[PDB]
Design a protein around this nucleic acid. Structure first.
Length: 224
RNA sequence: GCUGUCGUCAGCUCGUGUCGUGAGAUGUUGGGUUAAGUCCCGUAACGAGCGCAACCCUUGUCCUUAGUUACCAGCACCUCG
């Protein structure tokens, strides 16, 4: 599936500075070089296919997993990879409580998807003046924060994270509701809320696509 | 029941969510902006309500309808009204 040689090409071994390292990555660190911690690979791959093995199962069970990466680096890649598997996502900001407070999120989703019908039905022309608040402030805002989670339906069956520290609000919500989490952890990350860890670079552009492309192909294989 | 007042000051809250053993906090803070909690951007908050504003009268321009008791541009009459 995924070779070790492809990993170092994407720079998955590179982490952060030794100052910011998290002691709980001591088991995932092969060593350090020029004041930069480098992640062990011989443990990364066997743990990496297990994440691909798990997502294989629930994809066959027709289960929804959320593609959340909110960093500006891995912003667009998450959205495009989620769409390829036709799978919901969030990449601008983890809003406070889509999971523990899904009830009001559904109300925001309701005003979202009804609002597209207003554009489709041509009701916009009936308002004419004082309309740009609807056109930009009202559609375009809602397409950002809930664009991916529009057709998601129910509660997630698993959660995919990038930079679990930056996207830490998501971890607490998923853990409280007992949602399994598969996130990429750097040398500065805390693997205490996530369940299926894989260690590697989490802000390099090459690294994030390698996860997401492998993440997506394990979902497309499971649609059958 | 009705009325003055802070004060037409711009604030006051609520439902879920979250944090804290708890009273409580968040939202409502922060960076700009406004007459305004007005709006924008961030943001464990999302939304909502009462407030602000607007919808309401009057006034400042024009158009359509109408010219009596109102008006008199162009006509004639006329005591010169």
């Amino acid at each position: 599936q995924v070779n070790m040689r492809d990993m170092l090409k994407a720079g998955v071994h590179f982490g952060h500075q030794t100052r910011y390292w998290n002691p709980k990555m001591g088991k995932f660190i092969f060593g350090a070089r020029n004041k930069i911690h480098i992640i062990n690979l011989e443990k990364t791959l066997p743990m990496f296919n297990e994440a691909l093995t798990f997502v294989e199962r629930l994809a066959a069970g027709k289960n929804k997993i959320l593609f959340v990466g909110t960093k500006r680096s891995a912003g667009k890649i998450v959205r495009e990879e989620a769409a390829r598997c036709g799978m919901p996502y969030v990449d601008h900001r983890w809003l406070g409580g889509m999971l523990t407070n899904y009830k009001t999120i559904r109300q925001s989703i309701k005003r979202l998807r009804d609002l597209e019908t207003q554009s489709q039905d041509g009701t916009f022309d009936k308002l004419t003046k004082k309309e740009a608040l609807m056109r930009s402030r009202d559609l375009e805002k809602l397409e950002r924060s809930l664009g991916g989670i529009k057709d998601m339906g129910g509660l997630p069956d698993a959660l995919f994270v990038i930079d679990v520290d930056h996207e830490r609000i998501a971890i607490t919500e998923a853990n409280k509701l007992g949602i399994p989490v598969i996130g990429v952890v750097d040398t500065n990350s805390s693997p205490e809320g996530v369940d299926y860890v894989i260690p590697g670079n989490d802000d390099a552009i090459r690294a994030v696509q390698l996860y997401l492309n492998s993440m997506a192909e394990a979902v497309i294989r499971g649609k059958q």
